[PDB]
Design a protein around this ligand. Sequence first.
Ligand SMILES: *[C@@H]1O[C@H](CO)[C@@H](O[C@@H]2O[C@H](CO)[C@@H](O[C@@H]3O[C@H](CO)[C@@H](O)[C@H](O)[C@@H]3O)[C@H](O)[C@H]2NC(C)=O)[C@H](O)[C@H]1NC(C)=O
Ligand SMILES: *[C@@H]1O[C@H](CO)[C@@H](O)[C@H](O)[C@H]1NC(C)=O
Lengths: 111, 303, 140, 185
Amino acid sequence: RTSECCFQDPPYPDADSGSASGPRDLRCYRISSDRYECSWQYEGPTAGVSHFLRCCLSSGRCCYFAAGSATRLQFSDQAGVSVLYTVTLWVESWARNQTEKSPEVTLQLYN
Amino acid sequence: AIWELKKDVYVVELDWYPDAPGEMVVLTCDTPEEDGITWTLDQSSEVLGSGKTLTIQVKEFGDAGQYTCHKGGEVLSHSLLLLHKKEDGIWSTDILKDQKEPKNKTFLRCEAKNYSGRFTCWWLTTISTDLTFSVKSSRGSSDPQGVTCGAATLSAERVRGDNKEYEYSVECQEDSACPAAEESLPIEVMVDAVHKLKYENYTSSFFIRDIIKPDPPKNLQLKPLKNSRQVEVSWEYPDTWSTPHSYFSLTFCVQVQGKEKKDRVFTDKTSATVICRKNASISVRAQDRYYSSSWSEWASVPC
Amino acid sequence: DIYCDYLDFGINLTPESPESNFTAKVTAVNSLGSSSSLPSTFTFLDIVRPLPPWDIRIKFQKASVSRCTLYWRDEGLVLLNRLRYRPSNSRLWNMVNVTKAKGRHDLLDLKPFTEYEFQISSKLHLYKGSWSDWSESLRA
Amino acid sequence: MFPCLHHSQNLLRAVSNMLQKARQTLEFYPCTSEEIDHEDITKDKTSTVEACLPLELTKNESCLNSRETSFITNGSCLASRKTSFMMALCLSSIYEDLKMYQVEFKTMNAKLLMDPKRQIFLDQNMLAVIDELMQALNFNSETVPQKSSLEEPDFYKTKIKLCILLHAFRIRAVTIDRVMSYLNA
Ligand SMILES: *[C@@H]1O[C@H](CO)[C@@H](O[C@@H]2O[C@H](CO)[C@@H](O[C@@H]3O[C@H](CO)[C@@H](O)[C@H](O)[C@@H]3O)[C@H](O)[C@H]2NC(C)=O)[C@H](O)[C@H]1NC(C)=O
Ligand SMILES: *[C@@H]1O[C@H](CO)[C@@H](O)[C@H](O)[C@H]1NC(C)=O
């Protein structure tokens, strides 16, 4: 749970799409052999906006990372995300009590 | 391949390329035979397999961890799994960081201050927590229990960039009773870095004379000659340095630049005379006279 | 030379008779003044000092017996001698005098074969001769 | 001042200059300390590694193996009644080390001269210093006979062997210098 993915379902009760304003341009790149970074841009600004990176492995055990008002996260081979096999990644933000979802992207993540 | 680093710990070597099949891994328990042994990986009661034998290819890091041998409600044995990633056929090196000061691919830097054989090795790693190091040493391979390496200890927490590299060092003493004039075999030090489920190993070979770094000259004092501009300066050999001081000798370099570019003078003698400008400091350095060695820290006395 | 540790007479002194009187004086002279040492009279025996015995041999009386025979060699004119029979681990006592024999015979030695240090000295004259320096220690 | 110490200091300096020349002459041949393995010809023949130590350092005497090669050759460097056996055995072993190296160096030099060009050849001054030191170390000094061959050897092998010997000899020269300094003081 500490700077590592949590397999348990995210705390917010409803993931229903909230509004026209959505996080966009989710992209993941390999900074180093064991360092990685994913960048997402939120279209609508908020003082209390909270950003969450929720991914799903090939097994289907979707897990959610915890982040606090950041467009970027950096994780290592053992965060929980597979860095050799296919792995989807998507971003959800609870701002205004509505959770908007960045379009899901599947990347090898080894590049 | 699968090999045991220590009892109940098994390091598995895996190639690192996308969509890679895993090595067939077999788990066995050295316990009185029980019909119905169950097996868990996570702390959760999800049960992975039944029987005294569990088969599970370690295709990814998630599949490596403490498999637990438990039956009857009692944990019969334990099966921790460690992973040694190999990328393009080359062993991974992620836990420690390449200093590069001597040359590329240098992760271990060792030093000594005496011919006694006491030496210390410093390795810089940027991983803050969940880090353990195993250190073993020997003269060549012939000496069994040749060197008695101590245990790794965190030493410093500097802030290079924002990474905050942490420096860990070991204290090792050549335990050979027989004294010998010259060394024919290089001392070899191996650090078995372990982080979480990832295992790495680093090997360094060196000679004590090459890594020797003298401590600063002791009892430096300035004595002005009567009615002369020059000032005689006298220094003494460090107590820590090996004895006798005749067989093992040092060369002193004296620089008077203080605060013209290079006033350095190399004197074997323990006393040299240098004109002292009122606005400068006089500093002395020590190196092994016989062979090229790392220079000592400057010893400065105000002038 | 302004500083002299000692001055050596190249010619060796052969004494017409063992009891003779030879007197030595030293004079120091400088621009300001002159000081002369009091005359000191020395007999030849006082001046001569025997050399430490150069040779040493250990034999257990040609047997495994405790008794030991020591075959050393030194300057011919020696009328006395002394030997160290002290145990090597702890020094005890050394005999004050040995007979006028280059080769020791029937010396009392410890039954064990443990290493023992051996030192030897000779006296040119008992009445007025200095003792020689102890010879290099012989191990076992 | 010790005359043998002066010869040993001359030896270390002569090897240092020859080693620098060897690195400059053989640019391609690898002659850096990092790329050249340490191999000592006198590994088992002589006991300089054990016998030549300060008296304080050597105590158990068990490690001196059965008075190995205990020739104890008498010589002009020390006096017969002056120093302990530990230094007498050491001086004999040092004489033997210089004899093993000089015989080999002369063999290499004789092969090097045949080269059509003169890329490198052993320093005559360095060889002379080794002989002078041996004469002081042991009265029964044997002068190596002029060596020659009736055929031409491969030169690359001689030039790699040369670099391996020079570096090992330099370490031996410092060891002799340390012993000579201890004898003087
Ligand atoms: C440094 O890390 C490597 C990576 O594992 C170690 O190489 C591996 O060493 C083990 C231990 O010897 C080998 O496992 C066993 O080897 C023996 C002897 O060949 C054999 O009888 C066993 O059946 C098993 O194979 C393993 O094969 C070997 N890996 C490779 C690729 O050769 C190395 O030992 C480590 N060094 C240190 C000092 O920790
Ligand atoms: C030497 O002098 C002492 C005292 O002055 C005297 O007893 C002795 O007989 C003298 N010796 C000779 C040979 O005159």
